[PDB]
From a paper:
The type VI secretion system (T6SS) is a machinery widespread in Gram-negative bacteria and dedicated to the delivery of toxins in bacterial and eukaryotic host cells. The phage tail-related syringe-like tubular structure is composed of an internal tube tipped by a spike-like complex, wrapped by a contractile sheath and tethered to the membrane through contacts with components of a trans-envelope multiprotein complex. This membrane-associated complex is composed of the TssL and TssM inner membrane proteins and of the TssJ outer membrane lipoprotein. By combining interactions with inner membrane and outer membrane-associated components, the TssM protein crosses the cell envelope and is therefore central to the T6SS membrane complex. Nanobodies were raised by immunization of llamas with the purified periplasmic domain of the EAEC TssM protein (TssMp).
Two nanobodies, called nb02 and nb25, were selected for further studies based on their high affinity for TssM and on their amino-acid differences in the variable regions, suggesting they bind distinct regions of TssMp. The two selected nanobodies, nb02 and nb25, sharing 77% sequence identity, were produced in the periplasm of E. coli, purified to homogeneity and concentrated to 10 mg/ml. Both nb02 and nb25 behaved as monomers in size-exclusion chromatography and both crystallized readily, allowing to solve their three-dimensional structures by molecular replacement. More importantly, large differences can be observed on the CDR3 regions, notably in terms of size (14-residue long for nb02, 19-residue long for nb25). Noteworthy, the nb25 CDR3 region is stabilized by a disulfide bridge between Cys-106 and CDR2 Cys-50 and extends out of the nanobody core, providing a large putative binding area for the antigen. Analysis of the SPR curves indicate that nb02, nb25 and nb42 bind to TssMp with KD values of 66.8±2 nM, 1.61± 0.1 nM and 1.76± 0.1 nM, respectively. By contrast, the TssMp-nb25 complex does not bind TssJ demonstrating that nb25 interferes with TssJ binding on TssMp. This result suggests that nb25 and TssJ share the same TssM binding site or that nb25 binding on TssMp causes steric hindrance preventing TssJ binding. Analysis of the peaks by SDS-PAGE (inset) showed that peak 1 (~ 90 kDa) contained TssMp and nb25 (theoretical weight of the TssMp-nb25 complex = 98 kDa), while peak 2 (~ 18 kDa) contained TssJ (theoretical weight = 17 kDa) and peak 3 (~ 14 kDa), the excess of nb25 (theoretical weight = 14 kDa). These data confirm that nb25 binds to TssMp and chases TssJ from the pre-assembled TssMp-TssJ complex. By contrast, the periplasmic production of nb25 and nb42 inhibited the function of the T6SS as (i) no Hcp1 was found in the culture supernatant of 17–2 cells producing these VHHs and (ii) these cells did not have any growth advantage when co-cultured with E. coli K-12 cells.
Author numbering: 1 to 135
The structure:
């Protein structure tokens, strides 16, 4: 059985950082590309990062490029998404997904209309101008 488990979500002050992790199991990690996606209520799901465990290629849309960085640790079958300089509009459920990486390299198409093979259940990220009001 395949599982993708996201963790690292939370509620953070605007300008702050989070690090999401995607724990993968049940498939040959190095043969796949892992994408991070997000969906906020009222919007369509969108790709925020791609990393290929096969060729090391990465892709980020302009909305997050420079702020978010994906990395892969094959010893743990984990992919991370370091998110810096978070903005309120980055609030969303974040999902990780996997797709066979043979014959592809990371682009907007891979994390867009191409489709993924496996999906995680998602982790909530909330970015607040007044985080102190919630804890």
């Amino acid at each position: 059985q395949v599982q993708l488990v996201e963790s690292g979500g939370g509620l953070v002050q605007a300008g702050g950082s989070l690090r999401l992790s995607c724990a993968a199991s049940g498939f040959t990690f190095e043969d796949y590309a892992i994408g991070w996606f997000r969906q906020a209520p009222g919007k369509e799901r969108e790709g925020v990062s791609c990393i290929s465990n096969l060729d090391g290629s990465t892709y980020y849309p302009d909305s997050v490029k420079g702020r978010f960085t994906a990395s892969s640790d094959k010893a743990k079958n984990m992919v991370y998404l370091q998110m810096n300089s978070l903005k309120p509009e980055d609030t969303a459920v974040y999902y990780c997904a996997a797709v066979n990486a043979q014959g592809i390299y990371c682009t907007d198409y891979i994390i867009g209309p191409y489709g993924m093979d496996y999906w995680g259940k998602g982790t909530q990220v909330t970015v607040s101008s007044h985080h102190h009001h919630h804890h």
